[PDB]
Design a protein around this nucleic acid. Structure first.
Lengths: 362, 557, 86, 339
DNA sequence: ACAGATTTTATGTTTAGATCTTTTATGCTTG
DNA sequence: CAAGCATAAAAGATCTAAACATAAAATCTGT
């Protein structure tokens, strides 16, 4: 009878053996070409018209922010470009002018990346804002240092003048590695600080399920509707589309493949050496993660690279490896005995696919 | 590198050197940018002073709440208990948010150590005990200015170590979240610390739901042990209605007769207050502040709240206000009907004080009373107590007699208040997605200039067009049939003509000559749209080894 | 069939149930009693068992003594010996 | 020797040896009993710990003047049997009979009950100046026997629980004592009969502060858990037969968020729209989950958004029922099929 | 340049997160 | 419909890597 009610759902709650193999074959290159052609040619002018219409709402957003209201953007389409345009070009220069010189720093946090880690985000926030250290007594018995430091920051900032010193853009607040309770609790405690501004964007329908009473209070959101039907080119980059994204959606290997496709020939060669050494170690030791016990030693890697004329010494290797570390394609830690270890956190099957799809073509 | 491929990367924008004196203000010139800058500056300063005036009283009320609850719980903690030192007294804080600094009074002969435990910091009994003993040792050593192992024997040796009596007070921050097996084991462990005759223990359970769950979960022996001394204390911001009334009265005084509260606005306040109890006062403050700032933002006449600027009326102001419905139904004309302060607030305050001093009635909502008075059925709210029958004669109130209240009022007729604080999230998404016509503006002035002036009008955006079929689809959907229907709904020749419209690219035209170019560009669009739906949660996929079927998750409305 | 037996209420049989499972007459659904060594015991201590979070009424147990042995033990003169077999 | 210097059993062997050698000037052989009273009551217990203490005595010097003998104390008789092949001498302690436990309670509590200040205050207030210690002992013994005969079937033979019940019920019993009552044993039983029938060991002296929307969410969650999905459309057509196995006795089933929302909309009364799911509904649901009322089906690090997480109600029938009457919404109506 | 301050090697101690394996709650399916 | 048959997902054994932690020897810093 009905289709858009609970009665309609109950009515709707009660076969062709054709897969996509018989469907027209799709190649990734032509897929990207056609999708790109459609993205910036389909509804360009209406999209710019809507963007200009909703840009005039920016002073209202700034006024809401300057009164202790963390701001959220929800709606269909990609708000990444819109929210970045709002925060970087309009919010920061205007707040810098109003506070008085230098612009207010803008920490933009890509939440669609499954490799986003809360430790690194707080490392950036404490490198930029530079809060006071917590005393030994305040550390408590093995308590989480991030949350305790944030609570100390709240205590310190309850008395400072109410002028914004940072805006923390949060793209795709309901993404794969940003929806987990730990990072959400961090953001919940962080947003109470008046001196920082939390502008975020959500996409999932059940996104408000992530916030309890306390977290909703600490966020203190003011929901705003933005819907411009943008095609979300950047969001889809980190996950595969040929397999529709149904498999390894949160793996993060597709983003690594995209970034490594055209990075540098020598970086690709040394990454191939590291990957091959990791597979050899896995074979020496079922699909398992590339943990530390299977990784490659830093001295061993330097010797192997020197044998292949990739990196002559420690300095160049470390300098060019910091780029991979910052993008989470690899990790460097220290073993229990003190030996340095470099490893790739990708699954052995994912590592083999990466080796045989981009690395092996040279 | 590509910054979009990064994560959590800071950016320092290069602010322009161009600047002015006082162009930097969030408030914008209303009435098509015709108002002068002085009016905007005056609006800004009056908003700031009024916001400070309101929030000062709000902070005073909040601090009063915290001080009163702390004093009451501290008084109940000791209460001059003559009970024999064979059990520990327990205080169940009914429905208490775990945000309070329980202060322990300093005693000359007894240390008073507050040990706070949380579900995150209590995986099991041994860690409960180690954290508690570490906190005890640290606090005792800090007060008192070799080492001892972290176990219960530290309590045994406390009199010998520090030459003083002990009083440990356990504050369980979230007693509902802790799995009650380890909490019960920890309580039984603490029971073993009563053989010393120099240590007294006090337990505080920050219960949120009720004691029914505590009775159900805890062992019977533990409940029997607790029952020897328990004190059910009901601490909450929503209990007694004596604290929301103070904040609402503070707001009423900070708007005074200068502003008026619409009946529907207070009705919305009451409705949203009734749907939340754990955190009520903060939500009320947020709603009031948002309404106030919105009213000063999108209303041009807020600059004329005080009489001193009444003379600042200009031709545009009078021209706009001429279309006021109250004026049609009915400078110097406005002021003689503006400076008349509204007696509703004073009458409400007098009635509340009169009933709360000697009428011996306290359990009432000042918001509900104000809403009822605004409607005009004050008898229907004063007759429930059945005690002011002989006092109703002097409590009668003259009906509403006011004019030009549209320009000075707090209301939500454009729907911003409801859609900015409690929006219908999923409902808004579906409303925007089903009817995309009202979301994307339709333009025809520059369709000649654009390259796709004939295809934009005829067809619909891919994602919404797919959502149309998805809503018109069945519970379980084959991907093949869904794509077939989507392509059939797709015009054929127009897509090819659009492809031919670009001569710059060469791969596109190379693929254009292929007979099934349309059949594959439609497929590419379908995969993009289904991926977007999966990301947004509209659709879900069954076992990936089959991947031939999908299930609809969200239904419209 | 009938002197009169007081059918004890739910909240008064809960204590008998706790005593009975405390005397190791019942066991949890699939519960290992003591771990082999210290590492396994520590691992178990850090973990949170599902049966702990399930409410008290719905925790599924298992029996130490089958009904036939219960019949074999209880004396014939007892007043519950009629119901000791199906 | 610093007691914190021992971290492994070997260090304990070495420290005990070092302490015992420095006491070699003792004149005669001395045995020191170390009573590990409650060894099985350890919270970090494992099968491979007791035998360390069993074989500890082998590693200590044979000819030392001071010998340490262990006297353990366990309370499980299934932990003991694990080491039943060690053939270590043991003394098993059987439980107590009803007469035995009554006699023990009399012996250990008549003095304290007689010396209660409340009884003395009652006597001096009621002016009975003809009493002996024998009369007080008799009345205390009568109270102990009455409480035992009234609650032995409930409490078993545990002395601790009987002591708790006696401590709980003595004040009222002595408050119901007057002049001619004390000299008549049956008068107290016939006048204070309330105490000895219904036990009182619960915090409630003898529900949820949730919102209306949260209460309805809880009711809808329970309905989803304890109803078959294929019957949902037929039952909820608001605009071979039902099973009689009473599924309310079994563990709650796992449902999905969409079904919960649909049935919540179905059961919510019309106010003033069908209460379209908004921020408030989802926030209330999340607050219910963080109260451990609607438990999910995955371990920690929960992500509510993945299409692989399912919800199940985490309250028994009593709480949900009395919530239903708290909001005056019928609950034994949709379960009338299952009575 | 001599004692303090920092570092380097070397563990112990809890929390957060992983995959394997076993069992059993789901569907598929005739009348 | 149930049984059979299959795959699937909950509950937990078993484990590792990381955050948090202390400590003794050797190095690096200022008078």
């Amino acid at each position: 009878s009905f289709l858009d009610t609970f009665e309609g759902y109950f009515d709707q709650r009660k076969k062709s053996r054709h897969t996509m193999s018989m469907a027209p074959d799709v190649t990734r290159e032509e897929f990207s070409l056609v999708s790109n052609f459609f993205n910036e040619n389909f509804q360009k002018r209406p999209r710019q018209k809507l963007f200009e219409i909703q840009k005039k709402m920016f002073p209202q957003y700034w006024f809401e922010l300057t009164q202790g209201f963390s701001l959220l953007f929800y709606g269909v389409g990609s708000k990444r470009n819109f929210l970045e345009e709002f925060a970087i070009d309009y919010l920061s220069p205007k707040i810098a002018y109003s506070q008085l010189v230098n612009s207010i720093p803008c920490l933009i946090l890509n939440g669609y990346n499954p490799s986003c880690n809360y430790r690194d985000v707080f490392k950036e926030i404490t490198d930029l804002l530079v809060p006071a250290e917590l005393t030994r007594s305040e550390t408590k018995y093995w308590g989480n240092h991030v949350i305790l430091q944030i609570q100390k920051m709240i205590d310190f900032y309850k008395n400072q003048p109410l002028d914004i010193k940072l805006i923390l853009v949060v793209h795709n607040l309901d993404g794969p590695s940003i929806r987990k309770n730990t990072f959400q609790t961090m953001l919940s405690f962080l947003s109470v600080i008046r001196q920082i501004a939390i502008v975020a964007s959500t996409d999932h329908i059940y996104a408000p399920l992530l916030w309890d009473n306390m977290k909703a209070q600490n966020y203190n959101f003011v929901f705003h509707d933005i819907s411009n039907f943008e095609p979300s080119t950047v969001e889809s980059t980190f996950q595969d589309v040929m397999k529709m994204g149904k498999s390894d959606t949160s793996s993060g290997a597709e983003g690594a493949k995209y970034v490594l496709q055209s990075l540098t020939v020598n970086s690709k060669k040394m990454y191939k050496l590291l990957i091959e050494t990791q597979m050899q170690n896995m074979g020496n030791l079922g699909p398992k993660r590339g943990t530390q016990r299977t990784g490659v030693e830093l001295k061993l890697f330097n010797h192997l690279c020197a044998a292949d004329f990739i990196a002559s010494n420690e300095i160049a290797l470390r300098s060019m490896l910091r780029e991979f570390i910052e993008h989470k394609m690899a990790n460097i830690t220290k073993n229990n005995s003190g030996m340095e270890i470099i490893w790739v956190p990708y699954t052995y099957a994912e590592l083999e696919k990466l080796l045989k799809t981009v690395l092996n073509t040279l | 590198f590509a910054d979009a491929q990064r994560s959590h990367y800071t950016v320092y924008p290069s602010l322009p050197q161009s600047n002015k004196n006082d162009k930097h203000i969030p408030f914008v010139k209303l009435l098509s940018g015709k108002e002068s800058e002085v009016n905007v500056e005056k609006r800004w300063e009056l908003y700031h002073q009024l916001h400070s005036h309101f929030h000062d009283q709000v902070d005073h009320i909040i601090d009063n709440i915290e001080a009163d609850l702390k004093a009451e719980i501290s008084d109940l903690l000791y209460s001059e208990t003559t009970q024999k030192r064979r059990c520990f007294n327990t205080i169940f804080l009914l429905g208490s948010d775990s945000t309070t600094k329980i202060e322990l009074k300093d005693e000359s002969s007894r240390y008073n150590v507050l040990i706070e435990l949380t579900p995150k910091e209590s995986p099991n009994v041994r860690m409960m005990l180690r954290r508690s003993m570490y906190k005890l040792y640290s606090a005792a050593d800090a007060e008192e200015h070799n080492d001892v192992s972290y176990d219960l024997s530290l309590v045994e040796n406390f009199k010998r170590l520090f030459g003083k009596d002990l009083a440990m007070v356990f504050n369980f921050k979230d007693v509902d979240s802790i799995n009650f097996n380890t909490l019960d084991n920890f309580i039984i462990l603490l029971k073993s610390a009563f053989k010393y005759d120099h240590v007294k223990i006090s337990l505080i359970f920050n219960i949120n739901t009720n004691l029914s769950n505590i009775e159900k979960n805890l062992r019977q022996s533990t409940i029997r042990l607790l029952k020897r001394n328990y004190h059910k204390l009901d601490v909450s911001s929503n209990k007694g209605f004596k604290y929301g009334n103070q904040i609402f009265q503070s707001f009423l005084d900070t708007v005074d007769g200068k502003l008026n509260l619409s009946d529907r606005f207070v009705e919305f306040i009451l409705s949203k207050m009734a749907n939340n109890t754990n955190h009520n006062l903060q939500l009320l403050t947020k709603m009031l502040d948002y309404s106030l700032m919105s009213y000063f933002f999108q209303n041009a006449f807020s600059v004329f709240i005080d009489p001193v600027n009444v003379d600042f009326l200009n031709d545009d102001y009078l021209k706009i206000l001429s279309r006021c419905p109250t004026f049609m139904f009915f400078e110097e004309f406005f002021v003689e009907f503006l400076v008349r302060e509204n007696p509703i607030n004073g009458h409400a305050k007098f009635v509340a004080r009169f009933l709360e001093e000697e009428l011996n009635i306290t359990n009432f909502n000042l918001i509900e009373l104000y809403h009822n008075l605004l409607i005009g059925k004050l008898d229907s709210y004063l007759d429930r107590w059945s005690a002011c029958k002989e006092y109703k004669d002097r409590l009668h109130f003259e009906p509403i007699d006011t004019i030009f209240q549209e320009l000075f009022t707090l209301d939500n007729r454009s729907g911003l208040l409801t859609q900015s604080i409690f929006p219908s999230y999923k409902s808004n998404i579906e409303d925007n997605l089903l009817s995309w016509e009202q979301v994307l503006p339709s333009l025809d002035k520059e369709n000649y200039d654009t390259l796709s002036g004939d295809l934009d009008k005829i067809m619909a955006p891919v994602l919404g067009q797919l959502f149309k079929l998805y809503r018109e689809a069945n519970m379980t959907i084959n991907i093949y049939d869904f794509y077939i229907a989507f392509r059939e709904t797709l015009p054929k020749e127009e897509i090819l003509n659009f492809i031919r419209k670009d001569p710059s690219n060469t791969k596109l035209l190379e693929l254009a000559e292929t007979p099934d170019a349309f059949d594959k560009v439609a497929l590419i669009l379908f995969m993009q749209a289904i991926f977007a739906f999966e990301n947004m949660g509209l659709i879900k996929f069954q076992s990936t080894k089959s991947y031939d079927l999908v299930e609809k998750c969200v239904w419209r409305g | 069939r009938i002197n009169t037996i007081k059918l004890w209420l739910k909240k008064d049989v809960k204590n008998v149930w706790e005593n009975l499972v405390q005397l190791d007459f019942f066991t949890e659904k699939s519960a290992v009693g003591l771990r082999d060594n210290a590492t396994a015991a520590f691992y178990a201590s850090n973990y949170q068992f599902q049966g702990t979070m399930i409410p008290f009424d719905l925790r599924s147990y298992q029996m130490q003594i089958i009904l036939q042995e219960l019949r074999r033990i209880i004396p014939k003169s007892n007043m519950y010996y009629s119901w000791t077999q199906l | 020797y610093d007691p914190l210097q021992v971290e492994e059993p070997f260090l304990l062997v070495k420290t005990l040896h070092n302490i015992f050698v420095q006491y070699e000037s003792l004149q005669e052989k001395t045995c020191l009993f170390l009573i590990l009273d409650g060894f099985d009551s350890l919270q970090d217990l494992d099968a491979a710990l007791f035998n360390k203490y069993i074989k500890l005595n082998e590693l200590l010097p044979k000819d030392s003047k001071i010998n340490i003998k262990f006297i353990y104390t366990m309370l499980e008789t299934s932990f003991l049997q694990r080491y039943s092949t060690h053939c270590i001498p043991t003394v098993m302690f059987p439980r107590y009979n009803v007469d035995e436990v009554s006699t023990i309670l009399v012996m250990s509590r008549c003095g304290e009950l007689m010396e209660d200040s409340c009884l003395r205050k009652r006597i001096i207030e009621e002016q009975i100046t003809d009493c002996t210690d024998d009369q007080f002992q008799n009345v205390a013994a009568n109270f102990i026997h009455l409480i035992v005969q009234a609650f032995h079937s409930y409490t078993g033979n545990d002395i601790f629980a009987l002591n708790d019940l006696i401590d709980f019920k003595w004040p009222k019993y002595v408050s119901r004592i007057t002049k001619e009552n004390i000299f008549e044993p049956l008068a107290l039983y016939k006048s204070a009969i309330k105490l000895f029938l219904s036990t009182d060991d619960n915090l409630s002296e003898n529900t949820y502060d949730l919102s209306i929307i949260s209460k309805y969410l809880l009711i809808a969650s329970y309905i989803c858990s304890y109803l078959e999905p294929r019957y949902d459309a037929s039952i909820f057509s608001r605009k071979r037969k039902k099973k009689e196995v009473n599924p309310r006795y079994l563990q709650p089933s796992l449902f999905a968020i969409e079904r919960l929302l649909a049935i919540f909309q179905a059961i919510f009364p019309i106010q003033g729209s069908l209460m379209k799911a908004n921020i408030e509904v989802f926030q209330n649901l999340s607050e219910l989950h963080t109260l451990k009322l609607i438990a999910t089906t995955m371990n920690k690090n929960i992500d509510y958004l993945s299409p692989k997480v399912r919800w199940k109600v985490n309250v028994p029938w009593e709480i949900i029922k009395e919530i239903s009457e708290s909001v005056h919404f019928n609950i034994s109506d949709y379960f009338s099929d299952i009575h």
